[PDB]
């Protein structure tokens, strides 16, 4: 239908505009019907003809006849060559005609075809429904305090502001010469009245703790007030799309329609300023001073010496290996850790070397997403080259390359590149880096295909999931997936990250900050006017209402404590109350140094009717009221904690008019945040959960295979783990934890035995084994069994003392296990426990093919079937302290603080949860596993849904990617609402 052409960037175009060549524009036409108030222009176009570009091609009458290019009247559908202002799709874009023959777009969000619709309805609906690391560096350089612009430069930059009011601001410096600042220009760029706080990347943590915490010694944390950059350098996090950035806040406040204008103004002004200031990269940016180069060389030499010392000590191999790994794995891990930490230290030193003028630092401090490692490789060291998560394998016979010696584990071999890219790579280093790059190319090639398949499968899974008009989420077959979207029936693009401010603080701190002590009559005068102070002090109903509302807020805090363990104050709420309070303060020019005229009871009442006005489930029917309370519980608690009288009169210090405006704004924003019915919630959730799969590049499966088996219902996970917690004293001391471990880990006769041999005894009293003679004489006297019934053959097994001691196994347990397994006719005798070289003997009680091969087969079917201890499903158990707080027990102290206790926990490869839960002294509340099928078969459908969403959140957040909880909840409820676990449609 159309002509495809490569895309060429064009900064001068609008973000929503596309540059289309005139030839391609005239190739295909848009059909328009004649209107009484457009007949003249259509007549002009049809008079121009098909020879010229801005003409028409075909005319269709009311009868459907087609005429090629003459009278035009009502009802005639004429197709004319597309012109400026038209809408095309590849998301819809506005068409602009440009001379040359390439499609043109702006690159600000991240050969292709285009299509323009013919009917007006689809055009209208696409119109109503539809800064990449390039300008970040120049924005960072533009917001420097050093930037001073002359009058002509200021005027030239000002002309490129589409939203400019035309009033030239007074320069930051008037004398000796009128000099503006880049901060002033960007302040003019910023639209509306946006207030934002965002720390810079360079901003160290000690600035806030010490003095100068907001006079910004090193151009610290960015502050923007009243929609204009007060202070700071705008890096990626302060400008790129993120949580609470300038662009994000401006969008959420007053519309993408002018956030696009913000983008365009930033791009144009920054490009025009960089036209005269200029940016470049060259040799001098990688020639860091000889001091830092010498330091890097010294650190690399020290690392190589440490690796050599490790190798020579490993040759002497005293070097007790770490538990849970063999010698090879442990020492490879040690060498890899040494090389990696040396590389990281050299890279950090190289990055710190660039003081102010290096052009690489400009990209590093701003675009630190994935450029830090490249810069470190360029300047300091390329680093160790790895293949399949390991160093370079011995492709030859115990030798990586023929230029080395056999069995060479030094840093020079195995793929460690000492030299950086500037110094050039040695041929061996060059080949090792070629191997690493080939592995990376293979990984990317497979990862793109797998991610595409996962995205297609996920979008096909829930393409029909939609939010219905009753604020319920239902599928195509009309089963209610969720009563309210995201468990609150509210949209996911209108929410923000906030803090409860009442969950973390201790009881003493909570009452110090949330009680409004009116028995002071001195601080009230400072914070409130005289009339309000007198009214509060005199009236007792005021005090009673205050006490009751802080009491209900305290019980709300307790409800939060129950709902939110681990003290995770970071929450997702639709209305950013702190930002709204700041906006109210700025709009009304609230002076925090004067007493407020806002009555605390007015605050409480306003909060009460505001909460009454925030409705998600309609109706006074009692279960509807309960559903409304469920939907708005978290928001009401957050509002009460934030908009409390003490906070409002102590730190916010708002006025009555400001408070009323704040209430109105909160109500309006919450109403706008509600998820409107009919939204394609399923597709949005699928794409949101599938986009991180692009960057998804004790052994546990994780990443792409983990997600694949999670979306599937495969009964055989690659590494099925099962986390085990303990109750009390066992969780503290390691000995009792080991005792719990030994009875959970499977133990055959292989793991305990050391050697096995069948002897022939001409007489049990003879006892050809000399060491066992005295014990044999002691045992066979007064026999419990029949001596005449013993077989001449004997099976003597010497056990492993260390293995027996580790698992707390004893001889009598083994003997009784043998007796239970085979019966009385397997007479077994066990020497002793404390006796040196412990051993035990087995004979056969008489009751065809061969007598000795019979014992051979008995041992073969005995050595791996006795099951001395543990569960046969549990392959192995590892014991450790959880460093992260996710697996660490967290409780609430008597004072109310959240305290994390370090307790021993177990990770078992091999999954059997029912037996472990039934086991004594194993925590029956927190013990779980990553096998969703096992959880469903043991716990239930709701429990498996919760475990599945926890596992999906873990696999998503391992690499730092964040997915809104609404999408994950929708995905989990989609394939758990059937009553049983279901796989994806695929």
């Amino acid at each position: 239908f159309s002509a495809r052409t490569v895309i060429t960037p064009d900064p001068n175009l609008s973000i929503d505009q596309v540059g289309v060549p005139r030839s391609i524009a005239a190739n295909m036409t848009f059909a328009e019907i004649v209107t009484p108030f457009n007949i003249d222009r259509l007549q002009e176009l049809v008079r121009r003809g098909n020879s010229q570009y801005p003409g028409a091609k075909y005319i269709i009458r009311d009868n459907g006849d087609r005429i090629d290019l003459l009278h035009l009247q009502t009802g005639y559908k004429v197709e004319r060559h597309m012109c400026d202002g038209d809408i095309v799709i590849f998301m819809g874009h506005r068409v602009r005609i440009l001379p040359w023959s390439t499609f043109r777009l702006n690159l600000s969000v991240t050969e292709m075809n285009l299509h323009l619709p013919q009917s007006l309805e689809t055009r209208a609906e696409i119109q109503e429904l539809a800064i990449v690391q390039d300008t970040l560096t120049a924005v960072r350089k533009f917001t420097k305090r050093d930037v001073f612009l002359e009058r002509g430069e200021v005027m030239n930059l000002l002309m490129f502001l589409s939203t400019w009011d035309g009033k030239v601001p007074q320069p930051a410096i008037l004398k000796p010469r009128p000099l503006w600042t880049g901060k002033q220009i960007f302040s003019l760029i910023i639209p509306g009245h946006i207030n934002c706080i965002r720390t810079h990347s360079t901003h160290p943590d000690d600035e806030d703790s010490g003095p100068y915490k907001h006079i910004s010694p090193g151009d610290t944390k960015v502050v923007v007030e009243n929609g204009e950059l007060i202070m700071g350098i705008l890096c990626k996090k302060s400008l790129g799309t993120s949580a609470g950035s300038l662009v994000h806040i401006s969008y959420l406040e007053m519309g993408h329609d002018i956030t696009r204008l913000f983008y365009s103004n930033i791009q144009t002004v920054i490009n025009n300023w960089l036209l005269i200031e200029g940016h470049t990269i060259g040799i001098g940016d990688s020639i860091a001073d000889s001091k830092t180069y010498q330091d890097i060389q010294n650190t690399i030499k020290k690392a190589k010496q440490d690796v050599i010392e490790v190798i020579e000590k490993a040759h002497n191999n005293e070097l007790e290996p770490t538990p849970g790994n063999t010698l090879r794995q442990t020492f490879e891990n040690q060498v890899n850790r040494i090389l990696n930490d040396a590389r990281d230290k050299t890279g950090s030193s190289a990055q710190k070397s660039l003081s102010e003028y290096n052009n690489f630092k400009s990209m590093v401090v701003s675009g630190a997403k994935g450029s830090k490692i490249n810069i470190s490789q360029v300047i300091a060291v390329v680093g160790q080259q790895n293949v399949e998560g390991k160093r370079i394998p011995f492709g030859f016979k115990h030798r990586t390359l023929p230029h080395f010696i056999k069995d060479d584990y030094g840093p020079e071999s195995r793929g460690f590149v000492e030299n950086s890219y500037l110094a050039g790579l040695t041929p061996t280093e060059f080949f090792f880096h070629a191997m690493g790059g080939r592995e990376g190319l293979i990984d990317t090639a497979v990862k793109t295909a797998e991610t595409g398949y996962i995205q297609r499968r996920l979008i096909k899974s829930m393409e029909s999931v939609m939010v219905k008009y009753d604020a319920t989420v239902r599928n195509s077959i009309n089963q209610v997936v969720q009563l309210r979207y995201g468990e609150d029936g509210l949209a996911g693009e209108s929410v923000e990250f906030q803090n409860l401010a009442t969950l973390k603080p201790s009881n003493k701190a909570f009452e110090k900050k949330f009680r409004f002590d009116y028995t002071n009559e001195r601080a009230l005068r400072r914070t409130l006017q005289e009339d309000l102070v007198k009214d509060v002090l005199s009236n007792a109903h005021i005090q009673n209402e205050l006490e009751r509302e802080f009491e209900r807020m305290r019980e709300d805090r307790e409800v939060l404590r129950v709902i939110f363990p681990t003290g995770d104050s970071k929450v997702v709420l639709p209305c950013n109350l702190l930002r709204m309070i700041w906006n109210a303060q700025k709009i009304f020019h609230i002076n925090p140094r004067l007493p407020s005229d806002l009555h605390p009871i007015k605050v409480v009442e306003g909060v009460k009717e505001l909460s009454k006005k925030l409705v998600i489930v309609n109706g006074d029917d009692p279960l509807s009221r309960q559903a409304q309370e469920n939907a708005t519980l978290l928001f009401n608690i957050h509002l009460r904690s934030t908009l409390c009288s003490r906070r409002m009169a102590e730190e916010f210090r708002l006025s009555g008019e400001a408070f009323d405006w704040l209430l109105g704004e909160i109500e309006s924003k919450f109403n706008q945040a509600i998820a409107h019915p009919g939204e394609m919630v399923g597709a949005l959730a699928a794409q949101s959960l599938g986009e991180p799969a692009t960057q998804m590049t004790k052994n546990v499966t994780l990443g792409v295979p983990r997600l694949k088996e999670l979306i599937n219902i495969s009964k055989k996970p690659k590494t099925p783990s099962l986390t085990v917690f303990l109750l009390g004293q066992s969780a503290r001391d390691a000995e009792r934890a080991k005792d719990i471990l030994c009875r959970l880990e499977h133990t055959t006769l292989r793991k305990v035995t050391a050697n096995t041999a069948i002897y022939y005894d001409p007489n049990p009293q003879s006892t050809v084994v000399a060491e066992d003679q005295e014990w044999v004489n002691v045992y066979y006297e007064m026999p419990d069994f029949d001596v005449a019934r013993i077989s001449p053959w004997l099976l003597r097994v010497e056990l492993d003392r260390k293995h027996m001691t580790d698992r707390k196994l004893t001889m009598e347990q083994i003997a009784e296990k043998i007796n239970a397994g085979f019966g009385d006719d397997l007479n077994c005798i066990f020497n002793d426990d404390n006796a040196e070289k412990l051993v035990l003997r087995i004979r056969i009680m008489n009751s065809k093919m061969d007598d000795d091969v019979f014992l051979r087969c008995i041992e073969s079917n005995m050595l791996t079937d006795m099951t001395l201890q543990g569960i046969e499903q549990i392959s192995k158990v590892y014991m450790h302290l959880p460093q992260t707080d996710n697996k660490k027990k967290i409780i609430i102290t008597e004072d109310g603080e959240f305290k994390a206790l370090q307790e021993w926990i177990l990770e078992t490869d091999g999954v059997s949860l029912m037996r472990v839960l039934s086991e004594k002294d194993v925590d029956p509340v927190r013990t779980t596993s990553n096998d969703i099928v096992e959880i469903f078969t043991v716990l239930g459908i709701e429990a498996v849904r919760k475990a599945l969403e926890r596992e999906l959140y873990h696999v998503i957040s391992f690499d730092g990617s964040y997915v809104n909880y609404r999408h994950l909840a929708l995905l989990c409820d989609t394939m758990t609402c059937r009553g049983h676990l279901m796989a994806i449609t695929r």
Partner: protein, 209 residues
Amino acid sequence: DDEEETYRLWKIRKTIMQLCHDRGYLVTQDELDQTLEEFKAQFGDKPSEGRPRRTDLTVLVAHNDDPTDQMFVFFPEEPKVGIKTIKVYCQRMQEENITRALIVVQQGMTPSAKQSLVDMAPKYILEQFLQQELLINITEHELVPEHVVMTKEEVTELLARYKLRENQLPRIQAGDPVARYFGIKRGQVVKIIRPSETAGRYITYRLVQ
């Protein structure tokens, strides 16, 4: 061996009493938190030589709304329960005029025994419980949210309010561990309350199928 079986029986009895309390039966609070010493003193500290022999451990409870329910909980002596002892238990239920009983088995029953037990459902409601499944309360797990059985009139008014049908509502299998724990049969609805990081806590409903 001996004390291990005592602890196992104590855990089984505690979980059974918790299940009965969750089912709305009159369960005394002091007997809910029965310790090891209390269990040993009341019944016996050594199941060997048959002093506690799964007899006199049978639990008798009465529903709070209807005192005449008097649901039985049985612990058969034999490791595997048979059809004959099932008929004996049914005759006992008849001669105390009681239609609800649970059975705590060790290694289950035959599928034919299961079919025979479930066939005569209307006269007497019998359910089978494994030794391992009752060794711990599943509802106490952090993954398992709060489940409550809601009345038929509650289901009707819920459907009238939300304007839903039985099929449109999500359902939970009758063989689900929680469904068997609460003794809910096909056609009933269970209300699930679960903590939610976006709304504090959320309420959903699951049909039994």
